[PDB]
């Protein structure tokens with residue numbers, strides 16, 4: 254069964270939000286309706302502004318700004334590690350966070366900059382377990 | 385706990401896809417970055433093309449078409465019931481389907497037109513239980 258009786262009146266579909274997110278990632282893979290390029294040092298990442306805003310306090314601030322909402326190109330701080338950004342962008346579109354000993358510091362610093370609080374909190378807990 | 389060890393290597397966040405979908409619905413409520421208006425008889429519905437394509441075989445066909453991907457206005461068949469469309473648009477953004485005796489036929493006919501197969505299948509099962 255794909256549905257249940259929600260707490261409210263409605264029929265609710267268990268996997269709907271993840272099925273939507275999978276299609277948004279498929280659109281991203283195929284570069285369909287992507288409307289922004291995020292530049293991180295020498296690297297470029299195409300994405301959908303709505304997904305970025307939905308996942309980050311920094312992108313939410315940028316794309317709700319009357320002047321910046323219309324930008325096609327966004328340059329991040331040149332100190333941002335592109336691999337850390339790539340891991341977080343994949344997480345936004347998949348719910349899967351590829352945290353490893355060799356990338357955890359860059360992922361945490363990037364999530365702090367992008368304002369993804371629960372990812373920062375998660376990185377902190379994994380770091381504390383090895384200390 | 386908000387995360388777990390997925391079947392693959394990654395840490396996976398349980399509520400991430402639904403937290404993304406909630407923010408996409410908040411953006412829609414506030415008319416932020418909406419890029420299309422769907423016209424259903426005398427009624428207009430503002431939405432995000434990526435969400436519509438992610439949820440419907442008809443919108444996926446339209447917005448991947450080289451000519452139609454750029455349209456700001458999409459007119460649906462004038463025989464489509466606006467309430468049925470509204471219930472399905474809310475479902476796309478919430479995972480919640482407000483199926484009632486008084487709207488089930490219009491919801492089913494609209495889901496057939498929009499190519500939302502599992503919603504059609506769900507309507508059919510609820511209809512069959514009252515027959």
Ligand SMILES: Cn1c(=O)cc(NC(C)(C)c2ncc(C3CC3)cn2)c2cc(Nc3ccnc(Cl)c3C#N)ccc21
Pocket residue numbers: 303306307308309310311313368369370371372399400403404407408410411
């Ligand atoms: C700071 N922060 C985060 O740590 C995480 C954000 N998003 C994700 C999806 C990663 C998220 N949200 C909630 C939760 C916890 C379980 C409840 C976890 N993960 C987030 C999203 C917006 N974005 C918006 C905020 C409010 N209203 C709107 Cl319309 C938007 C948008 N778009 C802002 C700031 C944000």
Ligand SMILES: Cn1c(=O)cc(NC(C)(C)c2ncc(C3CC3)cn2)c2cc(Nc3ccnc(Cl)c3C#N)ccc21
Pocket residue numbers: 268269272273276277279280434437438439440441442444499500501502503
């Ligand atoms: C016909 N049909 C549907 O019944 C339902 C669609 N989407 C939702 C989210 C409502 C959905 N998907 C899967 C499932 C079942 C559990 C597995 C349930 N509900 C759907 C989405 C696309 N959209 C795409 C299809 C393929 N690849 C891409 Cl990139 C897109 C997009 N965008 C097409 C046709 C579709």
